[PDB]
Design a binder for this molecule. Sequence first.
Ligand SMILES: *CC(=O)N(C)CCCN1c2ccccc2Sc2ccccc21
Length: 97
Amino acid sequence: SKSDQFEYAWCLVRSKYNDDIRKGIVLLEELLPKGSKEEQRDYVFYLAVGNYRLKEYEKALKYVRGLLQTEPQNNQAKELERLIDKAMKKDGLLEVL
Ligand SMILES: *CC(=O)N(C)CCCN1c2ccccc2Sc2ccccc21
């Protein structure tokens, strides 16, 4: 079912290993067209999470900015954007340090 596939992908994105994170991202992109309104919004949040944990901050930011245009009152999405911003800001500083 779709709920079990999501839970599997969710756990992959929270895994301690980067192979799993990348797999979970792939599975999440597969689930996305088959999803209801609410499901897709969930998938997108964890796609931004997974990309953030992989240091793919520009992709993470792309997803979270869309989520915020769809659900502007989503405080969890606001927090994740804040974190992505902080990470990219510091990465830029370190690049020329
Ligand atoms: C989120 C999490 O880690 N849970 C719920 C424990 C079960 C983890 N797995 C899992 C991990 C590694 C290999 C196989 C499986 S089977 C499976 C199926 C659906 C959801 C999670 C998990």
